[PDB]
Structure 1
C-alpha cells in the first residue's frame, strides 16, 4: 500500500508516510531514440536525480483520429518502466498541450479540420477529442502510478494555461474531472505557471496544486512568494528551472553559464524545495517535429538547449557542476559514469541528382492532384507535415517582370517558386510577400510550400499551413489550382520509384559502406552540408530533420549510430530546396561531410 501525497501541516510531500523532496531533470522520450533511452536515464541517475520529468505529445501518438503509435520509439509505457527499473520516480506531464518547442504544442493538426476551433478552451469539439485521447492514454498510465507499483508520483494538468488568452476555467475543471475518473482520487495533480500573480490568475485552480517556473535571472524569494500566495501551505516547487534556453533559426545560439545554474540550484535546494531542471538532456527534433514562436520564427532541428547532457548525450562541464551541487544534499550513486559516446568522421560522401520534385510527382502523389478554384490549406488537403506543391497556369504574358504577391501574408511558411521549370526565387511568411517573375502565357507556375513548424506558444497555435489566402499576379487574384500533396517519406524510402540564384527543388542521393566485424563500428556522427543551402535529409530512410547552413546557428545534424549498417550500403538522401552545389563540371562538389564534432553555435 504505497502512498505519495502533499502534507500541508508540514510544507512537503510524504512518500510512504516519510518526508520527501524531488530533484528531477527533464528528458523527452520523443526526442531521444529508444536505442539510447537507458544511456540518458542512467547518466541522469548518476548525477543524483531522484526523478525525471517528461511530456507526452498527443500528436506523436495519434497522428490521425483513432490511429495510435505506442511501439518502439513511441513506446511511452516502456520508457516509464525503464525509468522505474533504474530507481527513478517520474513526474508525468501529459498536456494535452505541452508547449515544449514542439509542433503545435503537441496538439494534433487534424483538430484544425474544424476551421473555427478554439484550441485550449471548453470548445466542445476540442473537449470531445481530448476526452477520447485521455480515455486511451490515462488507462495506460494508471498502472504506472506510484500508488499501484509504478514510478509516477505527480501529474501536470495542462501547461502554463495562465499564459493563454482564453482563461476558460471550465476547461481546467473538465481536465481535473477526467484525470480523476481515470487515475483515482489519490494521485497528486498540479499546474505549472510563471511566477507572477499576472500568470497565476488564469492558470491556477482549486483542487490542483499550484506550482511555478523560473530560471537563473529571477529573484528566487519573490518567485516562491508568488507560489505561496496561491498555496499558503505545502511544498515549494519550481517545475521548470531553466538550465539553458531555446533557439530560433537565424538567431545566435542560446547559452546559460554553469555557475549561474549551480548558484540558483543550490539556493533552491537549500529552501527544501522540489525542483525540476528544464532541460536535463534536450536531444533532437527529428523529421518535422520542431515548433515555432510568434511573430513567426521556427526552432531548429537540434534541441541541445545548452543542457547538462548535450544533444548526443555527452557529459559536459555543466553536468558535473550540478552533480557536485546535488552531492551537498543527497548521497549520489557510486560507480563510474557511463561515457559520452564515441563519434567518428566518415568523411566526404559524393551524391548525385536523382529527380527534381517536378519529375517525381507520379511517385510523390500516386493518388493524383486535387483541383480547386482557389488555394487549399495543408489541412484541407489531408497533409500535416512537410511539403505541398501548388500549381497554376499563367493567364497574362510576363516577358517583363510581374509581381506575384500574397497580399495578406498567406504563404505559410515558405514557397519555392518556379515557372516552366525555371526557378524564380522564394516567398517567406512575414519577410517576403512579393516576388517578380517571368514566363509565357500558359506557362506552368509552381509553388513548393514548406510547413516550417506549427507555432507552439501564444494565441496563434491554430496554424493551418499552406497557401492560407490568395495570391495575386499584377494584382489579379490567381485561380484554377492543381494541388499536389507530397508523400516524401514513402518516396524517399523507395528511392523515388526506381530501385531494383537558385536551382529547382530536387532529391540527391549517394552511398557509403562501413566494414562489419569491427567491434566499435558503426559510431554516432554529425553530418554537414558545406555549399548546400536549405533542405531535408534522410539516411537509410530515417528523416534526421532540417538543414539550413545559410542561416545558422545550426550547421551540423546529429546521426545516431543505430540507423547505420554494415551488411549493405548506407544511403544518404538530400532534398535541396534553394541551391545545390551540383551543376558544376566537378562531381566532387556534389557532396556532404560527416564529422566528429557538432557545430550548433555558428555566428
Structure 2
C-alpha cells in the first residue's frame, strides 16, 4: 500500500506516488522527559512542521553489553508512535555514532575495554558490537517504517563520516548492508555531511543518498551545488539547518538571530528543498550525558541551543517567526498552540552537610576498592560516568610544597586533590598539570577524578577518562594505588545509606509543595549562589552539572513531574570545590529556585 521514495525525475520525494517535501525539526527524545514528549511534538506540529528528526543514542539504550533500556524515558518506539499519532513523519538517525554534543557521540564507553579499538571503522570488534546493536535496534524500527504503516520515511547512516579521519568506506558499506538486511530494500537510506567537496569525499557512498548540512552563514546556492555534485538528481536536502549553536562551559552563550534563521529558511524552502531545523527543541543533558570538543572543552548541562523552543519548551519569538515563514509555503494547523509551561519560584532551600565523599566510601563503593601498582582508567575499573577516587600514600615528607604533577597531561578531566583530608586544589586537563601539595610522610593522598564528558567529535573520541597516565611527586612516579569506583547514583538515592577549597561533599535539604492545588507542582529553575562546581539531584533524579564559577549557565531546568506533594522533596548537591557552608550562617548553605532561566550569563 504505502510507499516513500526518491523520484529522480522531479528532484523530489514521492510519498504514496505524490510529490512530497519535508519541513522537519530536530527533537532528541533522550533530552526531553517523556512527560513532555507530547507537549514538544504538538508545539512542533503547530509550527507547521510535517516531520521530526531524531538521534538514537546507542549508549542511552545499551549501558552494558546485552543489557537494554527501552522503557519509560528510554522508550524510542513509543516516542515514534507518538509522533505518528500526531500526524508527524520521522527522519531517523540511528548512528551508530551520532555526534550531537552527547557523551562519546552516542558510542558506549564499554567499547574502550579494547584499548586499541578504532571507533567508526572496519575494526572487527567495533563492527561486531555495532552488528549486535543493530540486530536489537533495527527490528524494532522496521514496523515503524512508512511502508509498514509507521512514520519513518528516511534513515541516516552514520553521521558526518566525511569529517572523520578514518575514511573507511568498507565501514560505510557494512552499515549499508546491515541496515538493508534489517529494514529492507525500499527504505530511503541517506548520509549527511558538511556542504563542501572536502567533507563529501569520505562521507558519501554509492547507494546512500547524499545530503548536506549548513547554517545561516553559508552561501545557500554553493551549499546545494556541493550536494548536486554527489547527487545530480533527487531532492535538495539540508539535514541540519542550524537554528542556533552549542555552548561550552567558560565560553559566551551561543545565539543566532531570528531574522537570519527566518531569511535562510525561506530561501531554502523556496528552492523546493527538504529541510530539517537543528535544533527545534534542544532540551537538556541530564545526569552525565553531555559531550565535549577537542582541545578539551565540555558542553554544559543545558542544550537550549538558542532553539525556537527553549530548553523548557517555551514558545519564543524565534518559534513564531519560523512558523510565519512556514505559513508562506504550507497551511499550518488551526487552533491555539499549547502554552509555555508555567514556572514557579519555590525560593530559597537550606541544605546541610551529609557526608564528605571521603567519609562515604562504604556506601559509594560497597564492593571495596581495586588495588593497582599504577593508576587505572574509568573503563578498566568498569565505571563509565561520574567520579572515581584515586588514593595513595605520600612516599616522602612534604613540609615544604612538593610538585604533584601529571607530566603527560593525564588527568581526564579534573581532579579534586586532598592530603590527610586537607584540600590542596585542582588538577585540570590541558590547563593545570601541576599542583603544589603539603603533608607528612605516609599521609593519605586522594584525587577525586571527574569524567566531564567524553569527546563527541574529531579524532579523539576514544576518550578513556580517569588518571590515564602516571602522576609524579617531586619528579618521582607515584605507585601503589587504591581506586574506588563511586556508585553516586545509588548513594544519593539512599541519602548516603543514612536512610580556597572545601572537601568534596554531599549536602541535602527538603522542601514541601502543597497537595490539592491544581497548578502545583510547576517547572522551576535551580540556582547555586555561593557554590562553585558540582552535581545536583532532586528526589534521586540527576539533573546534571552546575558551574556558576565558569558560566554561562547559572540555572538548571527542573521539570515538574519529578516533584511531589505527598512527601517532602529532597535536593542533594555534590559540591566539588567550595561550599558556602563553613560560615556560622546556615542560611548561606542554600540553593534557590527561580522562575526564569539564566543560561547566558557573562
CA distance in 2, matches of 1:303, 1:272: 30
Q: After TM superposition, give the deviation of residue 105 of structure 1 in Å.
A: 0.2
Question: 1:304 and 1:94 mapped to 2: Cα distance?
Answer: 22
Give the aligned partner of residue 280 of structure 1. Answer: 280
Measure, in 2, the Cα distance between the counterparts of 1:374 and 1:28.
Answer: 40
Partners in 2 of 1:510 and 1:236 — Cα distance?
A: 55
- How many Å separate the matches in 1 of 2:234 and 2:570? 56
Separation in structure 1 between the aligned mates of residue 587 and residue 295 of structure 2, nearest angstrom: 40
Q: Determine the structure 2 residue equivalent to 1:137.
A: 137
| Separation of aligned partners in 2, 1:379 and 1:338 | 44
Q: Deviations over 1:309-329 (max 9, x none)?
A: 000000000000000000000
Q: Deviations over 1:34-88 (max 9, x none)?
A: 0000000000000000000000000000000000000000000000000000000
Aligned-pair RMSD on alpha carbons?
0.3
How far the C-alpha of 1:593 sits from its partner, in A, is 0.2
Alignment of 1:364-375 (within 5 A): 364-375=364-375
Other structure's SS at 1:201 match: helix
Q: How far 1:27 moved relative to its partner? A: 0.2
Cα distance in 2 between the residues matched to 1:11 and 1:312: 38
In the TM superposition, residue 180 of structure 1 has moved relative to its aligned partner by 0.3
C-alpha distance in 2 between matches for 1:132 and 1:585: 57
Aligned-partner Cα distance in 2 for 1:531–1:498: 26
CA distance in 2, matches of 1:481, 1:23: 56
Which whole-Å deviations, capped at 9, do the CAs of 1:369-408 have from their partners, x for residues lacking one? 0000000000000000000000000000000000000000
**Distance in 2 of aligned mates of 1:185 and 1:395:** 65
Counterpart in 2 of 1:123?
123
Once the 2 structures are TM-superposed, how far is the Cα of residue 188 of structure 1 from its aligned partner? 0.2
Alignment partner of 1:223 is 2:203: no
Following the alignment from structure 1 to structure 2, what is the Cα–Cα distance between the partners of residues 319 and 574?
Answer: 34
User: What displacement does 1:15 show?
Assistant: 0.4
CA distance in 1, matches of 2:352, 2:496: 14
Deviation at residue 137 of structure 1 after TM alignment: 0.2
Distance 1:593 1:313 in 2: 22
Deviation per residue, 1:195-236 (Å, 9 max, x gap): 000000000000000000000000000000000000000000
> 5 Å matches for 1:524-535?
524-535=523-534
Alignment partner, residue 515 of structure 1: 514
1:179 and 1:361 map into 2 onto residues whose CA distance is 46
**How far 1:163 moved relative to its partner?**
0.2
Q: Matched residue of 2:592: which SS?
A: strand
Give the TM-score normalised by structure 2: 1.00
- Give the whole-Å Cα distance in 1 for the aligned partners of 2:152 and 2:454: 30
Question: Whole-Å Cα distance in 2 between the matches of residues 19 and 354 of structure 1?
Answer: 63
Cα distance per residue 1:4-40 (max 9 Å; x no partner):
0001011100000000000000000000000000000
Distance in structure 1 (CA, Å) of the matches to 2:20 and 2:579: 58
The alpha carbon displacement at 1:550 in A equals 0.3
1:298 Cα deviation after fit:
0.1
The Cα of 1:257 is off from its aligned counterpart by 0.1
Shift of 1:295: 0.1
**Structure 2 match to 1:158:** 158
Q: Which residue matches 2:251?
A: 251
Q: SS of the residue aligned with 1:281?
A: coil
Take 1:231 and 1:23, find their aligned partners in 2: how far apart are those partners? 20
Equivalents in 1 of 2:246, 2:599: separation in Å?
12
Match of 2:330 in 1: 330
1:540-565 Cα distance to aligned partner (Å, 9 max, x none) = 00000000000000000000000000
Unpaired runs of at least 5, structure 2: none
Whether 1:63 and 2:52 are equivalent positions in the alignment is no
Deviation at 1:149, TM superposition (A): 0.2
Deviation at 1:256, TM superposition (A): 0.2
- Cα distance in 2, alignment partners of residues 287 and 435 from structure 1: 29
Q: Give, in whole Å, the separation in 2 of the partners of 1:17 and 1:439.
A: 77
Deviation at 1:337, TM superposition (A): 0.4
Task: Give the match's secondary structure for 1:117.
Answer: coil
Cα distance in 2, alignment partners of residues 133 and 308 from structure 1: 33
Look up the SS of the partner of 1:139 in the other structure.
helix
**Mapped partners of 1:9, 1:314: distance in 2:** 41
C-alpha separation in 1, matches of 2:358 and 2:202: 50
Query: Aligned equivalents of 1:512 and 1:373: distance in 2?
Result: 46
Q: Find the counterpart in structure 1 of residue 535 from structure 2.
A: 536
Determine the C-alpha separation between the residues in 2 that align with 1:122 and 1:409: 30
1:312-331 map, 5 Å:
312-331=312-331
What secondary structure does 1:35 align onto?
helix
State the SS of the aligned residue for 1:593: strand
| SS of equivalent residue, structure 1 residue 460 | helix
Tell me the distance in 2 between the aligned counterparts of 1:213 and 1:566. Answer: 46
The runs of 5 or more residues in structure 1 that have no matched partner are none
CA deviation vs aligned residue, 1:517-554 (integer Å, no higher than 9, x gap): 00000000000000000000000000000000000000
Q: Distance in 2 between matches of 1:573 and 1:180?
A: 47
Structure 1's consecutive aligned runs of 4 or more residues displaced over 6 angstroms after TM superposition are: none
TM-superposed deviation, 1:130: 0.1
Instruction: Give the match's secondary structure for 1:78.
Output: helix
SS of match in other structure, 2:313 = coil
Taking the aligned partners of 1:445 and 1:390, their CA distance within structure 2 comes to: 8
* Cα distance in 2, alignment partners of residues 304 and 196 from structure 1: 28
- Alpha-carbon separation, structure 2, partners of 1:567 and 1:174: 53
- How far apart, in 1, do the equivalents of 2:51 and 2:12 lie? 16
1:75-134 deviation per Cα after TM superposition (whole angstroms, max 9, x unaligned): 000000000000000000000000000000000000000000000000000000000000
Whole-Å separation in 2 of the counterparts to 1:588 and 1:41: 41
Question: Whole-Å Cα distance in 2 between the matches of residues 530 and 9 of structure 1?
Answer: 61
Report the 3-state secondary structure (helix = DSSP H, G, I; strand = E; otherwise coil) of the residue aligned with 2:241: strand
**Deviation at residue 280 of structure 1 after TM alignment:** 0.1
- CA deviations 1:152-201 (Å, max 9, x no partner) are 00000000000000000000000000000000000000000000000000
Between the two proteins, the alignment pairs up a number of residues equal to: 602
Measure, in 2, the Cα distance between the counterparts of 1:432 and 1:77.
45
| Distance of 1:508 and 1:451 partners within structure 2 | 21
2-side partners of 1:198 and 1:390: how far apart? 44
